[model samples]
Target: MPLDPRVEQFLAQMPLSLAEARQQFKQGALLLDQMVPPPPVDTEDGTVVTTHGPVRIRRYIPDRLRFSHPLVFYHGGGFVFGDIDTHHGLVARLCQTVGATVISVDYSLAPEAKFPVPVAECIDVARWAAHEAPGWGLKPSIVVAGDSAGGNLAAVVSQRAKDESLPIAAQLLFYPALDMVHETPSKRDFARGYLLEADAMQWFGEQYLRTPDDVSHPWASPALSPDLTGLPPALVITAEYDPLRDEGEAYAEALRAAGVPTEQIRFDGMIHGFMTMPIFPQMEAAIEAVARFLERID
Candidate 1:
């Protein structure tokens, strides 16, 4: 399938610098929110204590519960930008679609926070949510989920949960940027003229990483993790036109090879960040797939 028409138009106006991207990303999210308003879900704004400090978090509770495992969601913005409000629509949709409690983490961004800071904060918040689930009257098992950079964080957190024995039930990733050091065919092919340019991703890495070595670290790039065994079940979503597509699928295969239950879905004609764009029909399909994945996992 060819690039989505609207997505093509979107790419045409994509920002060229980090500063512009940060501002436009939020506006883009707002535009999408208005175009396809999110379903109503009860939301609570609060803070969660992490090793880094107290971080802001937003909890979304659906009208009816469908899944036993709660989800800890991280929003995508290349690890440099984006926040709870920017991803409010998608988070709310996930909560409603999956009929589960969702805790959206507002982790610190990079350059200012730097490489391992965002990763540590995400892990801390996820662990906090899993630990606090029982007290919140929810099940103890937790699901770590996110999109793009957030997906990277979720993947790393999932790996840590397994190593630290945190009882992670599943991991849901949407067009995740897994490997920072290597370039896949998709990255070369869709490097330009896509909403998420490959160079922009490089720039993001420059901001997120402290040194070149950080790109290859397992905590920074889970795709580079030597061992993927003993991890929880996973639903890894990839977009056909996304530069990050190949690495996401490869990670899914690695998970399967390591004996982890993995479900990989590639949305044809979709580009990176489609999961956050409500205007795309693939977004609805993605959410439905997530619902099915949660059902089967539960």
Candidate 2:
């Protein structure tokens, strides 16, 4: 199959290096973000200081409506870069679209914090939200959600939540990197030229993982969990041209096999990070689909 002309043009215009990519990507995103008319939403910034580390978090909400399932969001930056500020607009839009509290967790990143730390931070926040969100006039539905690296974390969090019986509502993963060690057919086919290249992804893995042993560790690859039983209903969205295609789908399948409610959808001609790509039209549909699913849940 061929790349969608929209995404093909996007890749053709992306910067050549990580530095330039970071610079141009942010500049371009902010500019486009300005053009979109924002719906009514209120956001507050705070920190979740824990023994592990002080993590910054942003809470996005619409008008004071009684609701329980607040969305716990993680941003995609391969665990190296990206913070709450980078994902503000998307979360803001989702806050209105999903009609739930959206808490953006700025988990500690790579090179400095490394693995387990970020995972621990995410776990702590979900636990806190489950226990404390109702106090904030919000319902007790805790839905774990994130894109790319965050998707992996959400999946891992769900894995951990299984034992604790965390009151998590649902999970939404967008082009998630589920298996760090296994390079599937998509990795070989769209290894380069896509917005997320295989080398760059490996570079991200290097920054996040302290040793090779972490590659297939169950937390790192939640799909490898001996038991995916009792995980929340999941909506796994993958990009057809993404190197992560196979593993994201595999994780969804594992969840299904464990009797979890799960559905995996691959966007044709799309690549990794399509969910946050500012100009792409699919993001609108994706978010709408998410709203439809959330609406069906209690």
Candidate 3:
């Protein structure tokens, strides 16, 4: 279980310094604007609906789709940066691959919106999507999914849905940041490199959570939730060398212990966000796992 060679090569191609990586990410995002191909248009896409204040959503339906199940997706950027454009391709592919209508939400970010804001927006979007499912050729069954910080949001939303009696079929968490305390062994082991640094996570958490106590709150850190029972089934995916690996795996174990069916898969030679990069060989495998899971409950 050594570091993935591809991950090593990826890290080697860029400077190891955090500042350098930030700069490179900025440049990459800009270049990605040009190189990343436009996402395919959804022939059965739904109109943008503003369900909760300024929070908006765009629903994508596959052509000639017959299924009623829909997946409500949230994009990740440490709860600060990412939005719809950043995850457009991945969402489109998920819609096509899973054959499920995808309702991508533009949830409020942190440093401006903060913890409750994003979490509330996520819940509102989920509820609205569920209520409006029939209009979009979708059923009440929903699969909540997100990457990184968004994955954290997805998990929180799933918990909230259960508490509030909302209908959610399952959850799809990709390299999710479940625990904000950064106390896990993976945080110490994979802290410095591997695309996501421990310090960077701390910085992001500080910006997102208003108080120190928020770190222990189940809403801010779903892994800290006292019980995972009665929650929706879960598919938690992690990268072997990623800092969040341990916590993600731990959450999966907890879910199973609580009697919720769960499956955890660690991509042995991948780093964080590998699924977002289609060019990566592991991306296909990751998508296959996701597709199979979605198909299972569909």
Candidate 4:
């Protein structure tokens, strides 16, 4: 499959610099989000008050909840750019399609917050989500979810939850950047032209994990985990044209090989941000696949 025409037009405006990308990216996200608004859901802006400070969160509850598992999501912006507003549309669509309560986190971005801060903040949000589940018409079951850089955090958070005995029902990742310190064939093959440039990826990693030693830590890069035996089941989604494709699949493979129930689904002809762009048909299919997994794979 080739790149969709709508997606091609979308990418033409996005060869951006790290410095200007956040503001530009947010504007684009907000604009495009309005173009195809999903059906309405009950949404609330709230904060997880923690010792580290307040972690912002948005909750989306659909008409018919699924599996009683609250979806705790992290938005992707290479850990530097994205916010609740950028991901608001995606979470809203997910909430409607998946028919569940979806909580999206605005975890602190890096280069300022630095290594372990975002991860710690994610953990705090997830723990709080679990603690407050019942009041929001949800069970204590949580399904950790996210895309790209957010996927990395979701994977890491699940591991941390396991260590602390939190009940993570499952994980759903979309083209996750699993290994921060390593490169895969897809990284080189689709390195330059596929929207998420390898150089940009490196820049994001540098900004998030400033120290050389930070990349070696499992929390910063979940694929670096020495063992994956006791992690929750996962549904790993990838795109054919994405640079992070191979690493996402590798994480799923490793989890399955380690006796964890894991499934990997690759969308052909799609790129890194396909999961967010509803103009493309593949994006809808991807959402359906996710909703199915979250609905039946419990």
Output the number of the TM-score-best candidate: 1
Local distance difference test, each candidate: 0.88, 0.82, 0.80, 0.84
Residues 1-298 of candidate 4 have per-residue lDDT tens digits of: 7876776777787646665878888987877777876567799989998657899899887887765888899999998998988877778888889888889998989887887888888888888889888887778868899988899989988988967667788988988888877878998899988889988888887898868888878887789887999788899999888889988998999999999888789988778988777667787788888888876755
Model 3, residue 173: displacement in angstroms?
A: 0.6
lDDT by residue for model 1 over 1-298, one digit each (tens)?
Answer: 9877877777777655767868887887898899899888899999977777788999998899878888999999988989999999889989998999999999998877898887788877877887888877778889999999999989998988866667889999999888988889998998877688977888888898999888888988889989888898999999998889999999999999999999999988889888888877889889999999989986
Tens digit per residue, CA lDDT, model 3, 34-77:
65553475734333434436676777777557456778999988
lDDT of 2 by residue, 1-298 (tens): 7888888887887665656656665676676677564465888889887558788898897775434678899998889877787777677777887777888999987778888789889988888787777787766759999999999989888878867667788999988888877778988888988878888888888989989899889888776778788788999999998889988988888889889998778889888887776577887778877888787776
Q: How should the candidates be ordered by TM-score, best one leading?
A: 1, 4, 2, 3
Instruction: Report the candidate with higher TM-score, 1 versus 2.
Output: 1
- What does the lDDT read for residue 27 in candidate 2? 73
TM-scores for candidates 1 onward, in order: 0.95, 0.93, 0.90, 0.94
Q: Point out the higher-scoring one by lDDT: 3 or 4.
A: 4
- What lDDT would candidate 2 get against the real structure? 0.82
RMSD of each: 1.7, 2.2, 3.2, 1.9
Off by over 4 Å in 4: 12-19
For candidate 2, report its TM-score. Answer: 0.93
| Candidate 3 segments exceeding 4 Å error | 16-39, 43-52, 64-67
